[PDB]
C-alpha cells in the first residue's frame, strides 16, 4: 500500500461527483480520479462501490515532475507543463490552491477529453505536504538505512 491521500467529492447529481487519489510509488507520482457511480449511497448494507473504476483517469508522472510540482508549490516556477503520449497537463498555483488541468483519456478508452481538478484551502495544504514528503522520501534513504 502506497502513501496516498484521497479527496471524496460525492454529489446529489452523480454526474459531478468524483474521488481523486494522489499516491506515490518511490519516485513516481500516480494521480487518478474515479467518477461517481450512481446516486450517493445511504444504505450501510449496500456494498456496491460509490465510484467507477472502469471509467477512471490514471496518469503517471516522472521523478523530475514531482520536483517541478514542489517547485510550483514553493513558487520557484509559476507552472509546469507535462506532455506524454497519454496526456497534456499544466500544474499552477492559484490564489486559492493549485489547479491541474489539460487533456487526458480514461482507462481503456483511447479518446482525449478536457479535465481539470483543483486542490484548494486545506486540500492545498494536504497536497503541499504530500508532495514535499514524497520528494524527500523518493531517494531511498529510509529504506537503505533500515
Amino acid at each position: 500500500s502506497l502513501p496516498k491521500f484521497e479527496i471524496h467529492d460525492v454529489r446529489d447529481d452523480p454526474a459531478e461527483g468524483t474521488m481523486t487519489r494522489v499516491a506515490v510509488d518511490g519516485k513516481l507520482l500516480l494521480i487518478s480520479q474515479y467518477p461517481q457511480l450512481g446516486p450517493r449511497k445511504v444504505d450501510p448494507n449496500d456494498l456496491s462501490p460509490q465510484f467507477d473504476a472502469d471509467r477512471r483517469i490514471s496518469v503517471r508522472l516522472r521523478h523530475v515532475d514531482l520536483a517541478y510540482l514542489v517547485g510550483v508549490c514553493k513558487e520557484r516556477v509559476p507552472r509546469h507543463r507535462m506532455e506524454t503520449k497519454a496526456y497534456t497537463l499544466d500544474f499552477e498555483k492559484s490564489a486559492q490552491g493549485y489547479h491541474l488541468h489539460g487533456k487526458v483519456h480514461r482507462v481503456a478508452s483511447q479518446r482525449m477529453e478536457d479535465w481539470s481538478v483543483k486542490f484548494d484551502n486545506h486540500f492545498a495544504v494536504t497536497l503541499e505536504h504530500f508532495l514535499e514528503s514524497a520528494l524527500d522520501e523518493s531517494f531511498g534513504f529510509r529504506q537503505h538505512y533500515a
Binding site: 500500500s1 502513501p3 486540500f123 492545498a124 495544504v125 505536504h129 514528503s133 514524497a134
Partner: protein, 155 residues
C-alpha cells in the same frame, strides 16, 4: 563502555509512549492559573490533553492533573496546518463534548490561540492555551510529522 541504568530505561519509555510535546504554562505565584497542554499522536489521532497545575513546583507530588482530553481525527491535521502556515484564519472543532477554535493571535506575528469550551454529562469547562512563536513552530513541525507518518511515508 559504561553501564547506564536510567538512560536505558528512558530510551524504552520514549519509544513506547505516544510521540508528543508539552506546552508548559506553570504559575506557582498563582497555581489556579497554571496549566499544561500535552499534544500527542495516538492511533491516527492528534490528542490534546489539558491539565491544571496541581501544586507549586517547589514540592512533592504530580505538578499537574489532567482535566480534559480532546481527540482530533486525522482530517483536522491539514486544517490546523492551514492556520499555522497562514492560509486560513481559523479552524473550528465541533463535537458533543468539544467546541473549539484555533486562530492567529493579533498580539504578535506567528503566535496562535487555542480556545475551547468542553462539556460532559451537564458539566462544562472553558479553557485557553496560548502558543508563542516557539510553541507554534513546535506544533507546526509536530503536525507535519504526524501527517507524514499517518500518510504512510515511514512504512
Amino acid at each position: 563502555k559504561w553501564r547506564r541504568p536510567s538512560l536505558a530505561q528512558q530510551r524504552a519509555r520514549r519509544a513506547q509512549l505516544p510521540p508528543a510535546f508539552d506546552v508548559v504554562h506553570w504559575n506557582d505565584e498563582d497555581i489556579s492559573r497554571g496549566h499544561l497542554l500535552r499534544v500527542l499522536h495516538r492511533d491516527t489521532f492528534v490528542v490534546l490533553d489539558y491539565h491544571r497545575q496541581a501544586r507549586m513546583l517547589t514540592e512533592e507530588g504530580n505538578k499537574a492533573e489532567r482535566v480534559v482530553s480532546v481527540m482530533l481525527p486525522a482530517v483536522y491535521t491539514a486544517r490546523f496546518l492551514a492556520v499555522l502556515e497562514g492560509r486560513s484564519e481559523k479552524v473550528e472543532v465541533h463535537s458533543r463534548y468539544t467546541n473549539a477554535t484555533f486562530t492567529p493571535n493579533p498580539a504578535a506575528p506567528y503566535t496562535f490561540t487555542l480556545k475551547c469550551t468542553s462539556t460532559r454529562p451537564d458539566e462544562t469547562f472553558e479553557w485557553t492555551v496560548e502558543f508563542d512563536v516557539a510553541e507554534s513552530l513546535m506544533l507546526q513541525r509536530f503536525l507535519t510529522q504526524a501527517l507524514h507518518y499517518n500518510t504512510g511515508f515511514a512504512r
